[PDB]
Every structure is written in C-alpha cells, then in structure tokens.
Amino acid sequence: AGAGAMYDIKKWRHIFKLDPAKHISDDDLDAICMSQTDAIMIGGTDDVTEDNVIHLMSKIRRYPLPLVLEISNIESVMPGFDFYFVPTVLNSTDVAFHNGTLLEALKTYGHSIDFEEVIFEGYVVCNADSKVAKHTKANTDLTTEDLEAYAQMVNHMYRLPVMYIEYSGIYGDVSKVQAVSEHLTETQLFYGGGISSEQQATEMAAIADTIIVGDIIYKDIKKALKTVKI
Amino acid sequence: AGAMYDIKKWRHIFKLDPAKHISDDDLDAICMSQTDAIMIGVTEDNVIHLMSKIRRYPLPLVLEISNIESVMPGFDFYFVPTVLNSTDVAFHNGTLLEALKTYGHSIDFEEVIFEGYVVCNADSKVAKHTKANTDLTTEDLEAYAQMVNHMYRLPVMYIEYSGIYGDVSKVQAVSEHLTETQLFYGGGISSEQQATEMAAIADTIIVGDIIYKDIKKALKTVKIKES
Known part of the structure; x- marks a missing residue:
C-alpha cells in the first residue's frame, strides 16, 4: 500500500462489508451506500464468483464513496475497485490462506498490478462457529497471549498496514481487542x-481504528445504519 | 553506526554452521578477511566459544535464528527466517508465534531482521525439513519476489540453493522485481568466478560450505566486483 493510500485509509472509521453471495435489495443497498460509512467492501467466504462480484460492484459504482474488494480467490479478482485488500490468515493451518492463493494471483496479474492500491492485511479469525473459520481452516483456540503475539508479529516484523481481528458471527471479546491494540502502532487495527448497534459500534471503535459491519445489514437495515454513529 | 552496521551495504557474509568444525586458524582467516559480517546459522557451547573468538575482530556478528532454542544474547542483529514456499505453516509463522509468546516481552525488535526465504534445492536438508515446494518456475520466483517486495515488504529476500550453485537467470528474474527489499x-559459491557472477545479481552473497571444504577457495569468494 502506498503512502497516499494509507493516508486515506487511516482516516476511515467505519466500513460496511457486503457478501456477494447474498442478495441485497435496491432499497437496502441504497440506504447503505448513501450512509455515513467511510467505504463499502465486497467480501465473502465461499461462493464469491466473478459473476456475483461483477453484479454487486456494478450496482455500487452508481455511488461515489470508496469501493474496495477484499480478495477471496483468483476468479473474482477484477479491475475497477479503489483499493484491494488481501488477507493473509495468520492462524490458518493451510498455507493456501497464508500466501498460496496469493502466489497464483500474482502469477496471473502481477504484470499489471498497481501495488500502491493493494493492502496486505494480517487476519486473525477468532470465532469457531463461522463460515470464515471453517473456510480458512483457522485455529480459533486462541488466548489473549496468542493474540498479543500475533499483534507483535504483524506490527514489528511483518509491519503490515492492517491487522484484522475477525469475529464474524458474534460480538467479540473486548478485552482481547484491547490487548491487541496495545501492540499496534503503525499498523491499523480493523x-x-x-456489531449491530450504535453502542457496540462505539465501544469497538474506541479501541480499533476502523470497524467493519456486515451481517446486520441483511437482518435489520435500521440497526445497521445506527452503527455509523460512532 | 557506520557503513559497518548498515546491512544494505553488505555484499558478502561468511555463514558458519556451529555444528561443523573449523580450526582456529581458518576462523581467524575468515574474520580478518574483507567479508562484511559473520552470520552463525542449542549446541550453545561451541556458539559461545565461536562468538568469543569472532569478537576479537571489528566485524558484525549476527545470528540467524532457526528454532526457538537458537534464542540468545550477544549478537549485533538477529535474522529470522520465514520460508515462504514451505507447505507447513510452522515455517511461515507458527514457530515464530511460539517464540513471541515466550520471549516477545524481552526482544528489541529494532535488532530483528525478517528474511523472506525461498528454498530452491529439492535435494537439500532444509527443503526436506520445511516441506518446501521446490518445483519453481521462473514465474513462480518472480511472483514470490513481487510478494516479498510489494506485499510483505520485508527487508530481505533470501534465495537459498543450499549445497548447490543455483540458476543465474532465475536469480536475475527475481532481482528485477526487488526495489526496497535487499536480495541475499x-x-x-566455491570460487571467485561463482562469487562474482552471483554478486553482480544479488545484493549480498552468503558463503558457507566452501569454508569447511577448502579455506583457500572460501577466501577467494570475497573477491567480487563493485555493485
């Protein structure tokens, strides 16, 4: 990620994350895209395809806010996004999710990538009962110490621009997020x-630099909208 | 302070395997050579002795930490490998996670240099040990070079062929994608010929085995051309 790209992204506090495998009505998408969020991120687990990413991105391009793709696989990578976020799942037991899939993507597209718009994210999946934990083969048996060690790894050795604590499916352990933040300096904490209320949004946004809100969007659009009130 | 501790200026490093034997005379010869640093790759007692001798000379002494048992004070820098083409997460960051849980409170990270390794020799011990994918085409290596330089942005990418002399065109292809990342x-490398050919591509060449096989040839490996 370039210095200008991180200057912009460091200002973001709230991102609405859309799973292209899910359907979202025009009313709901319009509410999300016209809200006070800082950016829309397309991301999913399995079932992220060229067709569904194309279909969703085409509807979002109708709006001016930043649109980013969290790359899930090679098939769905495509031009047109403002930034590309690439997870390396640090607690995955499978190298495909560390850099194996990335390697294949770089072979295919490396010739023409603008790496200043690519943000490599150190991802730690923390909820066992989630499609992302199952999909990424994550080891979720993690203690606060494990998380602090991953935070030191990301901030001091890899020096990645972003560390992403992922509790997809449930509201996380606030003390753990706090513990991770104490080790992050130049790395942003996502x-x-x-998150499904102004209060949960505010609580986590007081610790993390940027909160990601996704599932609530499909369950209660008004509750999703309250999450931008940080 | 000085060019002496600036890793970006180093062109040649003699790498010692502390499990191997080296005479005091041969060690002094290495230490008084124009190499830029000595790198040691828990046989702790030979290591403490080894360090005591090298410290009689004004040259950087660094430790490459291979396992959690390698942890140890007294070095100018601590180089930590991550084997990017390993098929086992322990060698990407699993062993590193355990070491940080144990020692992360006591480490000065400014002295730690993370090395993005690509192990290239199928018939080597490290390849077997790290379960490395060594079926690398030039395109595979170029993609790992982009990954290290642009995504992980590590200070060092280390191409390791272990006991054999590697493919110059592949090391060349790699070098073309490296800008801020230094290429080790x-x-x-067993001769001035080989040292010179590789040092014209890589930023720093690492010379190890020839030290134990023929000290005279090893000493000739410091004869390279200007960068």
Missing part, C-alpha cells in the same frame, strides 16, 4: 464481528 |   | 543469495 475489527469485525457482531 | 546463498548456494554452492
């Missing part, structure tokens, strides 16, 4: 999982 |   | 090359 947190996602279970 | 190690593998079978």
